Amino acid sequence: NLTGDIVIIGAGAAGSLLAHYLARFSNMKIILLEAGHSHFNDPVVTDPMGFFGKYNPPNENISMSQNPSYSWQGAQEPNTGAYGNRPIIAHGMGFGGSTMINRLNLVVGGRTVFDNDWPVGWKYDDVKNYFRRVLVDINPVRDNTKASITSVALDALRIIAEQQIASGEPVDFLLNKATGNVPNVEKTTPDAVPLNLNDYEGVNSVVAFSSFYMGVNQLSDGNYIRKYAGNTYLNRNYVDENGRGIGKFSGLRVVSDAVVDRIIFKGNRAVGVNYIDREGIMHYVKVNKEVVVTSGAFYTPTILQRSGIGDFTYLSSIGVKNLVYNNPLVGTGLKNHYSPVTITRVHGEPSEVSRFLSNMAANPTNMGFKGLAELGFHRLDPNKPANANTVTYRKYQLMMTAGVGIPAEQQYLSGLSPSSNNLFTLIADDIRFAPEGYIKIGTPNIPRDVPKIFFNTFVTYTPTSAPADQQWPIAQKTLAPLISALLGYDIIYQTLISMNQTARDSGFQVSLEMVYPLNDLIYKLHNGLATYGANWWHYFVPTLVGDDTPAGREFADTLSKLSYYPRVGAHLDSHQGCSCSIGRTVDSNLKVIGTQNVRVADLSAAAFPPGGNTWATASMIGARAVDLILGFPYLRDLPVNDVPILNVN
Amino acid sequence: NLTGDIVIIGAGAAGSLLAHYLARFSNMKIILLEAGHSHFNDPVVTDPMGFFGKYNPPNENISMSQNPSYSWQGAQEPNTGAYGNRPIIAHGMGFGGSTMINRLNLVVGGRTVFDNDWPVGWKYDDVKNYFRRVLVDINPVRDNTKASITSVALDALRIIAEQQIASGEPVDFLLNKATGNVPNVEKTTPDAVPLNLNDYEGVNSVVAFSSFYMGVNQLSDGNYIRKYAGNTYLNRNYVDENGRGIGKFSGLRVVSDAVVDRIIFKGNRAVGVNYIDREGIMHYVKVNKEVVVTSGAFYTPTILQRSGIGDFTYLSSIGVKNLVYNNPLVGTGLKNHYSPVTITRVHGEPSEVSRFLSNMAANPTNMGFKGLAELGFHRLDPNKPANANTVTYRKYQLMMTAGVGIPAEQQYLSGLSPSSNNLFTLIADDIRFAPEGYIKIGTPNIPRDVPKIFFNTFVTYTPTSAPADQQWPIAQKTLAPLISALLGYDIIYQTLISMNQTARDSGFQVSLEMVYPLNDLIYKLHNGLATYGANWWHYFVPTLVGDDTPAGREFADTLSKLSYYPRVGAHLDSHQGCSCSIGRTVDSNLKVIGTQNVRVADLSAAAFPPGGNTWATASMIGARAVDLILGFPYLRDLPVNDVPILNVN
Numbered sequence A, B: 001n002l003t004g005d006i007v008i009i010g011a012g013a014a015g016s017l018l019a020h021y022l023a024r025f026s027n028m029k030i031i032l033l034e035a036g037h038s039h040f041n042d043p044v045v046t047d048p049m050g051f052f053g054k055y056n057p058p059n060e061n062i063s064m065s066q067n068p069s070y071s072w073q074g075a076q077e078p079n080t081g082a083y084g085n086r087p088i089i090a091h092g093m094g095f096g097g098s099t100m101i102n103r104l105n106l107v108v109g110g111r112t113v114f115d116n117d118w119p120v121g122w123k124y125d126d127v128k129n130y131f132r133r134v135l136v137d138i139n140p141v142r143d144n145t146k147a148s149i150t151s152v153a154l155d156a157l158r159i160i161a162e163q164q165i166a167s168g169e170p171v172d173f174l175l176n177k178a179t180g181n182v183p184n185v186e187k188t189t190p191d192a193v194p195l196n197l198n199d200y201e202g203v204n205s206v207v208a209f210s211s212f213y214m215g216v217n218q219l220s221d222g223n224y225i226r227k228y229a230g231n232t233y234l235n236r237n238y239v240d241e242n243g244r245g246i247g248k249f250s251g252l253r254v255v256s257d258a259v260v261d262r263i264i265f266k267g268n269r270a271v272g273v274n275y276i277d278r279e280g281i282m283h284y285v286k287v288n289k290e291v292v293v294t295s296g297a298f299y300t301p302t303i304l305q306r307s308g309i310g311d312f313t314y315l316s317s318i319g320v321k322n323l324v325y326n327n328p329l330v331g332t333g334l335k336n337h338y339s340p341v342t343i344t345r346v347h348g349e350p351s352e353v354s355r356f357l358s359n360m361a362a363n364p365t366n367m368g369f370k371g372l373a374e375l376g377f378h379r380l381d382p383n384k385p386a387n388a389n390t391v392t393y394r395k396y397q398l399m400m401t402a403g404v405g406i407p408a409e410q411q412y413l414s415g416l417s418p419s420s421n422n423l424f425t426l427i428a429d430d431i432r433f434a435p436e437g438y439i440k441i442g443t444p445n446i447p448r449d450v451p452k453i454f455f456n457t458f459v460t461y462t463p464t465s466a467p468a469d470q471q472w473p474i475a476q477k478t479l480a481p482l483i484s485a486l487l488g489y490d491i492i493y494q495t496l497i498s499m500n501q502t503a504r505d506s507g508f509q510v511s512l513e514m515v516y517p518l519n520d521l522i523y524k525l526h527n528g529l530a531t532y533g534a535n536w537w538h539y540f541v542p543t544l545v546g547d548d549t550p551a552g553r554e555f556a557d558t559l560s561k562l563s564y565y566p567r568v569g570a571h572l573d574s575h576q577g578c579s580c581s582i583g584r585t586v587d588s589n590l591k592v593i594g595t596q597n598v599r600v601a602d603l604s605a606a607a608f609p610p611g612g613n614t615w616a617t618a619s620m621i622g623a624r625a626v627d628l629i630l631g632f633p634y635l636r637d638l639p640v641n642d643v644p645i646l647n648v649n
């Protein structure tokens, strides 16, 4: 009954941008289908502080990610490395996709990752313009206030950096070789210029700064608003209430509350897509040129497999009727970030600790983030790439906030309840997280919130009856995440050690000591690390070492005991991706291998996790897909000053 | 073009029975729709020992409940009682429903529950016939191997019952009134008679027995077979591979791999239903006489709300197009069971402890359930109904099993590894669980695996500035499950203290005590119970009854500390139901209020959870529905010697 030319699945962080820009530069028809609906008039989502649970009913106070009305519930299979727990990860619904419910933080990832870990045609010098376009389209803002603790932390970081430069090691977490001998630490003078970590050139990869960039804008009244993909590209100024373009965009139509399940085929060419609406009737729309799937990391492999592309044996076993192309790589090698936490309690008298722990209240500009730096590889990490000693890589993202963020079980077990106001927290996020998994469809009837998702993070090692030299590489490969977590803990401990003297000489009379990981254990870890050198990680398996002295046995016991904290005392960030990576499921032209006219243009199609948060990356992939579909580098050569017009209502 | 007279939705524990006895006793064609498909030949479901995970790939070692191809994933919203945890409860898929993945334990429930907590027409003397029919049709078997510890436990229970009956207290857990002054404990003599707890007359309410009843059958080879509703009522004898009736059953037709979405109407009369098949197509089938929904506890209210019956405000807010009946009760009051776990350590010479703990290996006839008893209310329970001194109520279901059943986190924390061979578990089940919740849908597009499910278990009390005289009833109402759990812990403690003497007298020179609940803490709990009597539970709020007495401080501290284990060390049993009970949504005819020919025939329609495992109740309700639909008590007049024949292949 209907017809069309281009249909896009998922008005997310890339789908909305792609639809808007296809409508901008073309006369053909573009259709956008989205599972959810617009939420332009909700204080929970429109207000940035609504993410924190401000407009929630007293009997249903749950976050936006935990509402089935807002996001898909992606429960996973038990994690054998995490005591069998089943964390749930969510993808948002409606216009704007998952950007509706995020923390609104914006980063780029750096220049090294896009040059040494991506295929040709996707180096930094080809996507810097797209990064700039997206960043100036969102137009973030920085923090308003300036806490005293941030200056002390930056000074301590500068002291650590100068000590490391004086030592002269081949590679350290606080060394940047693109700037020379001078450390990349912002100065404490009131007139110090900000160290922008999303600079166009890419000089900063290991930089100590003081504020992130959030997609928040201030209105004329004086209250802040949340800016995301939906309220940037899909406002009433472009698409009306009916769901059709107005004036210049007359060729664009968007249907909301539409979920697709299957793609009609002709052997290699998609002939139509069917969707399910609120009343439950499936309609048929013709496809003339191409289709793009932008349903996210978890639901692009699912629609691909249910369409008839994937491992033939599995699809035939589960009863998939139509089979088109055979590929055992679909939905494989899923990557995600992971961030442990730590708590530090200050001592002294109430006046000084009150005047020192102030001005970190959450406001819509900092989102509770103070931020310290984005460090590199630790010197004693066994697993570094070849270019580690020559080119710096982003390994850790350091964050600090106020209060305590921990699940209540560990709060009760440790006894550090949030009643006390004399303690803060730090998060050493890991952007080089090693373990990967895969996604498989369960039943070929309807889209479902839970496919088969396997993700084993902190897996231990069992020795075999083999020579030790043949086992050590396998232990090195397997035991990477534990080493990374321990190195992050040691980094934070060194930061605290420097911060003690920095705060003592900065005019404050306080003493800072680690509390949550039982700082005596951290001290034992530091002593063992210093005494044992680079072979410290050999004591993960005491039997292979064979040492029986009390020092070695207690070091082994402490190392085993410290492995308990990252498994439960941490959080799993929702930065999943790389399920249809380039070179395995798709080529560098964003085309699936063996298909003719389908594309994937979301974070799933990425070939590697960026060195940080993953929003601008998805937006860039969408824009580059626009250029590849058109063939002309329109978005690369567009003037910077031309941006879409905001329209609140 | 496909049509039928009566359409049944959901081939669960009751739909299969209803369809079978509809085809047997009538000529009208019956159509059954099920989401899954037959698993007759799968060794994982057919072999009773396959429930424990014997036929799974080494790289996908997950149980049948956690596998999306076998069961739906019922992730619930976080509960403030369990530190915001989100346990997942699974409903089975395919022929037989959840009976495919259960432990097959069969318990009737008792007499008093069906007579005091159920309406007229659903009393015990009206459902005994159907309970007997179900038990005869399944034909369970008893245990094979006899354990020496079972006799010791039975003698200890007999001694405790003798003490309780000599004390002459008005009510206690080990007192029964259908027997008199003689304890209802099975004899320990070698020629003892089995003490059946599912007797026809229902005189058995508090019984100390030695073996449960499991739905397994021995074959000629010598191996057992899981006997559930699927192979019993829908085997190859009556329905072939193509799902058409054989002989008299020619009217019946069963379509596998069918997911129903909504029920169309004409103002007060349903006309047809639609389902999404394997090829993702919509099929419309005409309805002539009746439609019955038995989709389960979690998915009956969801389908009812998505159909057009339920709260108008919430459905209209979500976006449901059609509204029929304004019932604010659809999906209200969800009841489910609970089960804390304890661990006991046996001290002594290694040969003694090896000889004592023999013959507790799991078999396809006992499933590790040695079985102890079903107990009543504790004498110190603040909450007891009116008929406490008139009739006996069963509150607990005590069971014993070898090994340690606890999530691995607490195993690591306490150091009670399963590798040790001197520990066993005592489980104090709770069949009278107080708290309840509700079910709400999230998006009116497709039947989703995860709806909005709220269930808060262990909620604390908030003191208010007022005299405690008008505050105590509210605190008593709110603090019921904690009291029940602590009373069960005390029951297990005194059962163990009698176990010690009985084992010493029985020629076993072994000392034994509990470890996991921190035996000193439970000893302090028992001392405080004895000291304070009925005022023991007033110390959950130390502010309201503060005394500054060192004994008072110790009691308050040990009561606060003991509340952690029920929160962490327990498993939510999947006995959920009663969310669409009789008197709220349906009448005595099990007909939906405000409709004409809509009926519910599952466990969700139960007015109260039975005192035990809930497999038989669903089939009982299905048989009642058959009798109500037909109009003649055929199943009440069917001779016992008529049983359907099972077909292994």
Ligand SMILES: Cc1cc2nc3c(=O)[nH]c(=O)nc-3n(C[C@H](O)[C@H](O)[C@H](O)COP(=O)(O)OP(=O)(O)OC[C@H]3O[C@@H](n4cnc5c(N)ncnc54)[C@H](O)[C@@H]3O)c2cc1C
Binding pocket: A009, A010, A011, A012, A013, A014, A015, A033, A034, A035, A036, A065, A090, A091, A092, A093, A094, A095, A096, A097, A098, A099, A100, A101, A102, A103, A104, A105, A106, A107, A258, A259, A260, A261, A294, A295, A296, A297, A299, A303, A447, A574, A575, A602, A603, A604, A613, A614, A615, A616, A618
């Ligand atoms: C709690 C949370 C916090 C985050 N914080 C940050 C942060 O601070 N910084 C950062 O950079 N990133 C952050 N992210 C990540 C960011 O929100 C997303 O990763 C980003 O939107 C990536 O783009 P996407 O296309 O994957 O988005 P998606 O939302 O995954 O886009 C796909 C969308 O398409 C729709 N869709 C899916 N399947 C179907 C279907 N079958 N039919 C129809 N429509 C469908 C849905 O609306 C879905 O959301 C956060 C994410 C979460 C969940």
Ligand SMILES: Cc1cc2nc3c(=O)[nH]c(=O)nc-3n(C[C@H](O)[C@H](O)[C@H](O)COP(=O)(O)OP(=O)(O)OC[C@H]3O[C@@H](n4cnc5c(N)ncnc54)[C@H](O)[C@@H]3O)c2cc1C
Binding pocket: B009, B010, B011, B012, B013, B014, B015, B033, B034, B035, B036, B065, B090, B091, B092, B093, B094, B095, B096, B097, B098, B099, B100, B101, B102, B103, B104, B105, B106, B107, B258, B259, B260, B261, B294, B295, B296, B297, B299, B447, B574, B575, B576, B602, B603, B604, B612, B613, B614, B615, B616, B618
């Ligand atoms: C792990 C586990 C252990 C258990 N152990 C015991 C035990 O020892 N003793 C005991 O008495 N009970 C036990 N139970 C409970 C017992 O298995 C069930 O509660 C009982 O069979 C209830 O049956 P039901 O048909 O009402 O529910 P279900 O079995 O959940 O019935 C639902 C049926 O309808 C189908 N269906 C659902 N939604 C749709 C839809 N939209 N369209 C079409 N079809 C649909 C499903 O595929 C399924 O066949 C256990 C349950 C679990 C999960």
